Write an enzyme that holds these catalytic residues in place. Structure first.
Site, PDB file in Angstrom:
ATOM      1  N   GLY A  31       0.734  -1.258   0.000  1.00  0.00           N
ATOM      2  CA  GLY A  31       0.000   0.000   0.000  1.00  0.00           C
ATOM      3  C   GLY A  31       0.766   1.313   0.000  1.00  0.00           C
ATOM      4  N   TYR A  51       9.294   6.106   7.600  1.00  0.00           N
ATOM      5  CA  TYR A  51      10.373   5.542   6.810  1.00  0.00           C
ATOM      6  C   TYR A  51      10.692   6.604   5.759  1.00  0.00           C
ATOM      7  CZ  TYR A  51      10.239   0.525   8.245  1.00  0.00           C
ATOM      8  OH  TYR A  51      10.384  -0.675   8.908  1.00  0.00           O
TER       9      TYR A  51
HETATM   10  C1  LIG Z   1       8.273   8.303  -0.136  1.00  0.00           C
HETATM   11  N1  LIG Z   1       9.167   7.103  -0.020  1.00  0.00           N
HETATM   12  C2  LIG Z   1      10.541   7.277  -0.220  1.00  0.00           C
HETATM   13  C3  LIG Z   1      11.280   8.248  -1.002  1.00  0.00           C
HETATM   14  C4  LIG Z   1      12.736   8.165  -1.026  1.00  0.00           C
HETATM   15  C5  LIG Z   1      13.375   7.111  -0.269  1.00  0.00           C
HETATM   16  C6  LIG Z   1      12.677   6.130   0.516  1.00  0.00           C
HETATM   17  C7  LIG Z   1      11.273   6.219   0.534  1.00  0.00           C
HETATM   18  C8  LIG Z   1      10.263   5.364   1.238  1.00  0.00           C
HETATM   19  C9  LIG Z   1       9.857   4.154   0.368  1.00  0.00           C
HETATM   20  C10 LIG Z   1       8.721   3.869   1.393  1.00  0.00           C
HETATM   21  C11 LIG Z   1       9.156   4.001   2.695  1.00  0.00           C
HETATM   22  C12 LIG Z   1       8.134   4.541   3.445  1.00  0.00           C
HETATM   23  C13 LIG Z   1       6.841   3.701   3.421  1.00  0.00           C
HETATM   24  C14 LIG Z   1       6.385   4.084   2.022  1.00  0.00           C
HETATM   25  O1  LIG Z   1       5.225   3.966   1.585  1.00  0.00           O
HETATM   26  N2  LIG Z   1       7.469   4.631   1.244  1.00  0.00           N
HETATM   27  C15 LIG Z   1       7.914   5.990   1.711  1.00  0.00           C
HETATM   28  C16 LIG Z   1       7.873   6.085   3.217  1.00  0.00           C
HETATM   29  C17 LIG Z   1       9.105   6.435   1.173  1.00  0.00           C
HETATM   30  C18 LIG Z   1      10.385   4.607   2.576  1.00  0.00           C
HETATM   31  O2  LIG Z   1      11.315   3.785   2.619  1.00  0.00           O
END
Ligand SMILES: CN1c2ccccc2[C@]23C[C@H]4[C@H]([C@@H]5CC(O)N4[C@@H](C5)[C@H]12)[C@H]3O
Ligand SMILES: COc1ccc(C(=O)O)cc1
Length: 121
Positions: A31, A51
């Site tokens: 999700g 995260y």
């Molecule tokens: C925006 N996105 C990211 C943008 C740049 C780097 C890492 C992430 C995410 C992937 C992943 C996770 C959480 C949970 C989630 O749905 N995602 C978000 C926050 C992050 C987080 O790890």
């Protein structure tokens, strides 16, 4: 890492991450869109967001250590990413426990097309 997280969830709620919290609502699992369906789903949304504040960390595979001090979860010292990942997971587990009373099997294996709307972290 998912290993520490699923264990944390099991200890807290009695349920296994999979499949109680791997395909729940719009945010627990793969999700990533829509309006959280309920409190438990809101826990996963915030966990997601948490995260989200760590672009240079790898929450899924980076392992951290933690201990129980009479129930209370205490994240042990590791690298900077590991400490923060742990705090994110610790918060979600507690959030899960605090909302066990409203956990609904209705929102399990929830259809992707019903995750409608938008919410920013
Ligand atoms: C925006 N996105 C990211 C943008 C740049 C780097 C890492 C992430 C995410 C992937 C992943 C996770 C959480 C949970 C989630 O749905 N995602 C978000 C926050 C992050 C987080 O790890
Ligand atoms: C709760 O267990 C998992 C396992 C893998 C993933 C993923 O690969 O994105 C997410 C949650």
């Amino acid at each position: 890492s998912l290993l520490e997280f699923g264990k944390m969830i099991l200890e807290e709620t009695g349920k296994l991450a999979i499949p109680s919290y791997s395909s729940y609502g719009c945010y627990c699992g793969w999700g990533g869109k829509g309006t959280p369906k309920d409190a438990t789903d809101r826990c996963c949304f915030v966990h997601d967001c948490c995260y989200g504040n760590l672009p240079d960390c790898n929450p899924k595979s980076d392992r951290y250590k933690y201990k129980r001090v009479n129930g209370a979860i205490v994240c042990e010292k590791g690298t900077s990413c590991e400490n923060r990942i742990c705090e994110c997971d610790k918060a979600a587990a507690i959030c899960f426990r605090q909302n066990l009373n409203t956990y609904s099997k209705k929102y399990m294996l929830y259809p992707d097309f019903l995750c409608k709307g938008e919410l920013k972290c």
